[PDB]
Amino acid sequence: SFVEMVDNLRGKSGQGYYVEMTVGSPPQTLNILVDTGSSNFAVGAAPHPFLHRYYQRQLSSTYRDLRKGVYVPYTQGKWEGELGTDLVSIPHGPNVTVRANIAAITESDKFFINGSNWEGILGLAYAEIARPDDSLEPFFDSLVKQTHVPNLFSLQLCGAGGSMIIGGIDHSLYTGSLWYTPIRREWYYEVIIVRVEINGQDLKMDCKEYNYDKSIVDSGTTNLRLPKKVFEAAVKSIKAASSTEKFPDGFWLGEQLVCWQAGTTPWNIFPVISLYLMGEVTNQSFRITILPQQYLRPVEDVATSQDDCYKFAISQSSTGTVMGAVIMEGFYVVFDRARKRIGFAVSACHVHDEFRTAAVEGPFVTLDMEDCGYN
Numbered sequence: 001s002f003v004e005m006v007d008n009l010r011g012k013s014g015q016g017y018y019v020e021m022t023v024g025s026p027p028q029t030l031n032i033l034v035d036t037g038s039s040n041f042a043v044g045a046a047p048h049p050f051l052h053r054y055y056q057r058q059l060s061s062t063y064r065d066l067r068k069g070v071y072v073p074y075t076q077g078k079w080e081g082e083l084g085t086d087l088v089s090i091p092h093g094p095n096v097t098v099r100a101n102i103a104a105i106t107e108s109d110k111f112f113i114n115g116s117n118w119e120g121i122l123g124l125a126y127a128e129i130a131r132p133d134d135s136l137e138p139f140f141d142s143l144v145k146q147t148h149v150p151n152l153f154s155l156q157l158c159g160a161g162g163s164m165i166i167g168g169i170d171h172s173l174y175t176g177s178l179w180y181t182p183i184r185r186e187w188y189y190e191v192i193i194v195r196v197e198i199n200g201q202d203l204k205m206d207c208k209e210y211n212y213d214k215s216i217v218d219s220g221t222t223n224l225r226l227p228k229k230v231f232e233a234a235v236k237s238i239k240a241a242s243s244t245e246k247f248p249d250g251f252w253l254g255e256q257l258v259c260w261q262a263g264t265t266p267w268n269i270f271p272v273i274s275l276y277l278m279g280e281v282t283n284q285s286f287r288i289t290i291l292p293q294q295y296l297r298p299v300e301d302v303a304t305s306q307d308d309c310y311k312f313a314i315s316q317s318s319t320g321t322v323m324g325a326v327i328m329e330g331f332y333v334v335f336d337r338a339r340k341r342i343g344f345a346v347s348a349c350h351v352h353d354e355f356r357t358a359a360v361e362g363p364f365v366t367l368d369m370e371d372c373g374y375n
């Protein structure tokens with residue numbers, strides 16, 4: 001019965017993908033950002049310039065105050081509020097109702113986005129990174145304990161809406177085979193990258209550099225973020241491959257956006273990036289290939305024209321590798337919590353390049369993959 005959940009997501013990689021939910025009795029409708037990069041369920045509970053609606057605890061008869069404060073600092077943006085519990089449901093999700101923890105946001109800073117269309121956030125990662133501490137059971141954990149919903153979900157983010165299949169895998173949302181990588185540790189959705197190639201060229205770095213100090217799958221992050229050393233190597237390789245044309249130094253920093261005559265974007269000059277992930281069997285891995293149409297996020301024409309403009313969706317990180325929404329977009333991603341693994345398959349709503357195609361290929365042989373994990 002996953003068909004009811006197909007296409008239940010809206011938004012983009014820039015402002016975030018969100019799903020509709022209801023909290024309290026009577027049910028209060030709110031759009032909630034889908035974030036596999038955090039573990040707190042929180043909604044605006046007070047007026048805000050960017051909010052068109054918010055959670056009103058007083059109007060809910062099922063609301064319960066936990067008499068405890070909470071705050072959450074994200075890489076960018078933060079909020080604080082009061083903890084409590086209330087009945088929660090997902091209209092275009094499993095037909096169930098569960099009591100989960102809810103952080104009523106009373107104050108925030110650079111958290112809500114103007115015009116994003118969402119007023120809350122659904123942290124889908126594990127309790128280990130929940131605030132104030134791992135005692136605050138995350139939404140998905142509550143859902144799985146209180147109902148018969150299987151312990152797993154899948155995300156199909158489509159750039160250029162999308163689907164969040166709660167409790168299973170919808171075989172009609174992807175093509176080819178699903179390839180699985182182990183979830184290294186249950187806190188963020190941590191994985192291990194064992195090799196990286198640009199246009200078939202191996203970056204030739206100590207694979208530990210790829211996972212320094214970790215690598216995570218974050219639907220709540222827009223770009224592909226890479227550790228300093230890896231970012232520099234990647235940019236250097238991407239520059240050479242596209243040396244045909246020159247771009248502002250600010251462009252490679254994700255500041256300036258490059259434009260081209262409507263339909264003249266030189267995709268061919270931009271290389272494909274292949275990230276190899278640790279597999280399920282000894283010395284085995286697989287790779288996902290990212291096309292330029294993925295790491296070149298399209299943006300509105302800053303001018304008064306109508307030319308195709310984009311922003312370099314690859315940026316430097318100091319908190320490890322982050323496989324964000326722009327990476328997830330070409331693929332169907334299965335967060336198989338039950339079997340502690342993450343699956344990747346070519347999405348039905350994949351990118352359409354002329355002579356190239358985003359892919360998930362295997363199997364590959366890779367020795368000493370364990371040494372790729374950072375400690």
Ligand SMILES: CCCN1C(=O)OC[C@@H]1Cc1cc(C[C@@H]2CS(=O)(=O)C[C@H](NCc3cccc(C(C)C)c3)[C@H]2O)ccc1O
Pocket residue numbers: 012013014015016017033035037038039072073074075076077110111112113129130218219220221222223325
């Ligand atoms: C798809 C579009 C996503 N977006 C984005 O990147 O910036 C704006 C936009 C929407 C948006 C998303 C988030 C979720 C954050 C984003 S982050 O870029 O901050 C990485 C972090 N996950 C990793 C992380 C990093 C530090 C601390 C924590 C704890 C909460 C466990 C977790 C994640 O939860 C918070 C506020 C927002 O306005």
